[PDB]
Amino acid sequence: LTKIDAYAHILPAKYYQKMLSVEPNIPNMFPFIKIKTLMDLDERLTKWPDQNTKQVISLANISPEDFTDSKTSAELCQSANEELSNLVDQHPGKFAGAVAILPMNNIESACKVISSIKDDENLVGAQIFTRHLGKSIADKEFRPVLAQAAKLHVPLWMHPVFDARKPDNNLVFSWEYELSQAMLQLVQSDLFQDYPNLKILVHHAGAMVPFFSGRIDHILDEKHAQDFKKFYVDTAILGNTPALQLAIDYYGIDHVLFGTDAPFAVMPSGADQIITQAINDLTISDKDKQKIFHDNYYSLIKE
Template identity: 55%
Template sequence: MNQKLDIFAHVLPTNLLKSIKKDVPSIIEDNLFLQISSLTDLKLRHQNFPQDVKQIISNVNLNPEDYFDGEKSAQMCGDANDEMIQIQKANTDIFESVVAMVPMNNLDEAVKIIQQVSQNPSLVGIQLFTRALGKSIADPEFEIVFKTAAELNVPIWLHPVFDGRKPDNNLTFSWEYELTQAMYQLVLADYFEKYPNLKIIVHHAGAMVPFFAGRIKYTLPKYYEDFKKFYVDTAILGNSKALELALDFYGPKHLVFGTDAPFAVMPNGATQEIMQAIDEMNISDIQRNGIYRDNFINLLKEK
């Protein structure tokens, strides 16, 4: 049995939640996704878990920097990373490794965490979001994070968040736009040219980019090839043809298995639905094995 590696799955470290809740009592009521039981209930998480899958876990979108100063945020991120490592070690039958949190309002400490990731076999990368502190993740203020990650061969997981300036945010479409816009901004910042070893894994199959590849080619010809340098996951809740489109654009080595578990299909996520879509893709067995495991293993080889 070949082990499949789901590289984009989430947990909620309970001690982190408790720490934030002390100062933000309404945190759960303000963020309904935090109420999903299988983020914290690992007995529930184990139920009907596919025997041939292990998950790489990252925190849900709950960032200390949104609520606390840089010193406290750094401490909370460090503690949460340790907590997630302990969660993984206590559940090695379903969890493979951890993607670390970094405090974007304390970049010195963010750099230290990236250095820790490069040396700790339990940590495989860092998670960033499309916006931080009200700014694009491609803002020059944050460049040191990308520079350090590239120099140390630490992959970046890119997750969407809403842009609070917009009045009509919605879960179905807004996050795909935000991912696309962040990719556009990162490419225009020339990060792939400055940092050739930079590895960024984009959630939700690269969002709008594969569908609009032609527009990119003819309206942004200078940057077309840089858009292909992202890695993308399969977390679009099915749709084999869309996954084939993503594979066609990014190439067979840049598509990796990710489900966004435990979201979308209760209680544990859309793992079965996404695996069915991958299995129905019109691709070779070598390409399918690449998606399920080999591409991610190769991505990590330099870490």
């Protein structure tokens, strides 16, 4: 037993410095640059939250697709993935694996990224967002990428982004609504009808689905209602034992993975402590806790 934090975030120094050359106004546009452990690898390693934790690292949301053309974005993402792969290789007692960035403005190249994940031990999946370039993840534009991941058995990490079209976006509730929207949009566009074996890991314990499963069941038909159960979820809800229990009740124990949203929310290095405590406070077996902390991650990434 060792704890695998399946959803932690990083900004690798060379990629970050490449993205500053693309737009030097980025430290103004993105407030989370302040967090030292996101930016500074030695800071992260020094103030490491638990010695019994390894992290699965993915890029924080400064994606090249939002700043450059299709070709330059593909080059920047390949470079970022290479750097991410190196970080796991170089620090294998700290990083369990890395989640690759996709150039969603370059569909051909994004498909190549999915294919390259099988060829690299350090790259463990790819990260998708609830919206790419102002379109839903469920948009036909990105469906080939999702189809490729299903075909090759690559697990996808799904992350929220603010929808700028919606007024009153905030850090409290908007991202969770965005996660729920995206799942609904994927489900109703027949994603799991076409690809039942596709694995998506959803940030923040499946967002609004466990609490409002009663609605899903009564609004959607049988096949689509049950398709919401195909998602895997992390535990990144900052504690909350009974909410994590509700998530297990809906998804089953094998779909719930330890995840923290590190280094965010808890300074300096994320919420490893409060989340670990909340999983430990669950009235479930030790086998079940080991699945959450450890086993479910390895089931997810099996190829």
